[PDB]
Design a protein around this nucleic acid. Sequence first.
RNA 1: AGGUUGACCUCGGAUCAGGUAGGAGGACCCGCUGAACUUAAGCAUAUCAAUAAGCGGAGGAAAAGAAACCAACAGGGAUUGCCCUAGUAACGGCGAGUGAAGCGGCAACAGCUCAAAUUUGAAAGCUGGCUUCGGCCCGCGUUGUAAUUUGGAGAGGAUGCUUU
Lengths: 52, 202, 52, 122
Amino acid sequence: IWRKWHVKINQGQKRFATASALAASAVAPLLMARGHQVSTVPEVPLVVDSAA
Amino acid sequence: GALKYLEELSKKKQSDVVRFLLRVRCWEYRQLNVIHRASRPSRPDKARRLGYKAKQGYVIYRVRVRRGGRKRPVPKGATYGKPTNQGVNQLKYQRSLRATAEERVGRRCSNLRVLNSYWVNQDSTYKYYEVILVDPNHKAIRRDPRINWICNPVHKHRECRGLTSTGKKSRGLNKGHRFNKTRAGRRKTWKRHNTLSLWRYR
Amino acid sequence: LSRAPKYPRKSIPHEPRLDEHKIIIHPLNTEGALKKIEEQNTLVFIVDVKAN
Amino acid sequence: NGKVKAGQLWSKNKEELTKILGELKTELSQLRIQKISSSGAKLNKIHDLRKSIARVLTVINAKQRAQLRLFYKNKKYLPLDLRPKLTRALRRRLSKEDASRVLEKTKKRLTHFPQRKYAVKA
RNA sequence: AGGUUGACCUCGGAUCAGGUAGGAGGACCCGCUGAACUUAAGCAUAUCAAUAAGCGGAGGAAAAGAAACCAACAGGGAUUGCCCUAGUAACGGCGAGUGAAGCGGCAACAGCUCAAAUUUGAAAGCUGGCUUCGGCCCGCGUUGUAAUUUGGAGAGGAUGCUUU
């Protein structure tokens, strides 16, 4: 059980990867290449009113 | 009070009066049994400062133990291993003869709890102790808040676990740099220093 | 002095452990018993092992 | 027949309970010989009388113990079977009053300086 | 009656009245006792190891614990445990090796009881037995049970307000 199970990652690298994923989520070709069905989505990124 | 005078007289153990009393009492105790009940403490000041009270449930037992070192129970008194450059005559027991006396008195009276014990006399062969014991099942003991802690099951056989005064002295439970290895428990400290602590995000 | 207890240790005295319904279980229906009935005026029973 | 309900037994007193016990034991002793002599539906009946004897003995014992507890209601020493069982350590444990006894100096200190109810403004 | 009648002290008896101990479990805990294989070219220091086996004693935790402490600072402030101190100070044949602690951050925090005093204008204290539950008895105890005091103080005064 004293095998190394967890990985310690720099928080700066974690934040970098989260920002890169957020930037990639706004690219409509990347959504289709990742497999989402976004052909009927009116705009990317999709922002809905908070009153709803 | 008289007990101040008894304390200052008990400090002078080489005076003529104290040596005479110790001699006659050693004779009496050597012709009595090895373990026998004392009707009252022969050193009332020492018993009182160690916790004895003239209340039902407090018992005094007098005991003599053979003084000196110890010997390993090996055949013909010899070891068949690597040479140790020393004989079995010079091995020292790690607990006191006082602690041995408290254990034997507790085994004799298994229904009581050993509170403390004190030196009363000695000769070339024996050392003599008087042991204070408390009855946990006596109502006078159980109703008194100054002593009813001993009725709890965690204080069963303090003399067998080193929780008496001589046990603390032999375990070295003192504060400071001279007691670095033993102040919190020697084997516990060794296990703490020898454990390998591995964290998740190491 | 004899004992004069302030309370009985056993509140209810126990019933006879070996009474007659436990002593006699059933007779024997074998030909040995049936022969002994006519030739010996003897009845054969199966009884408790602890009964004399 | 021979299946005595416990609701009937809970109203009887000692002597007729012993009489019912005796007649059930007698009929059981007869029907064991009937069992070893022939095969029939009497095996259900011997089972019923065994359970009926058990019920009668249970009712008699319960009433005896209730009467003994009423007799020993106000006495200092009770029989060991009528004393509460708990565990051995629980029986040897200090009573609540002896555990809650405090010294008189402690009583004075807790009387004149207890734990107060307070709050700290932000 | 005095060759008698008793009081204490010590030691005994009882299937006396009431209780308690033993064994199990033993992963963790507190002690005692205690190796060798192994590693040092071999090997009596050493290392394995203050371990395994053996023995005694507890609990849901145990143990420790309110300084005869650390320090040498502008001083910290019971105990325990984690990180760090630190593979450091230090110890060690012919060297293989061994190896803490103060400070600092954190989890959690909690403080107290006796002996040594004359209540002396009143043993004020307590086990047990019987109770009509009001109490009454047999006793323990003055070779000291209550209240008071524990070093942070306290005892005595003075003083005027607060507290239950």
